């Protein structure tokens, strides 16, 4: 958001599309690992 | 209308379905002495308490329609 204005100044990271295709990876990572863990 | 009509039909469906207990005995003509007996044998609390009901209703209407 607008609060995160520091050396952390990556532009293409606040858009909803990039947030979506980041959350996809993170959720799929935890999900692949929970399936790996149960089985 | 439809609501009211439904209720009628519903009530009618009861009135014609249930086996009432016709109780074939000739009724009694003296339907005033008996009510006197019931006001002082069975249904005495409603007598004594409708008294104060009427008092309270008078006190209410007298002080809700008063012009001031």
């Amino acid at each position: 958001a607008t609060d995160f204005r520091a050396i952390m100044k990556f532009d293409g990271a606040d858009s909803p599309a990039m947030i979506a295709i980041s959350a996809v990876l993170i959720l799929g990572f935890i999900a692949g690992l929970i399936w790996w863990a149960l089985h | 209308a439809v609501v009211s009509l439904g209720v009628f039909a519903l009530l009618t469906k009861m009135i014609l379905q249930t086996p009432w207990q016709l109780s074939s005995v000739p009724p009694t003509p003296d339907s005033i002495t008996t009510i006197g007996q019931h006001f002082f044998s069975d249904f005495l609390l409603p007598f004594e308490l409708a008294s104060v009901l009427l008092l309270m209703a008078l006190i209410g209407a007298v002080v809700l329609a008063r012009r001031e």
């Binding site: 958001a1 909803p16 947030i19 979506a20 980041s22 959350a23 | 609501v3 439904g6 209720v7 519903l10």
Partner: protein, 52 residues
Amino acid sequence: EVDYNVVDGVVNLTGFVTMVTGEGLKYLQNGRAQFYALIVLLAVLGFVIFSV
């Protein structure tokens, strides 16, 4: 940003939903005695249909 939007927004949306539900359900209460006369006795008579 996944934390502040995809995780936080989902649960703040719960408050949003149970807030807008209250904002939009009060219109059932409309200030009409005849509307109560409807949804008092028509409020029931459904409770007889799935009864007998």
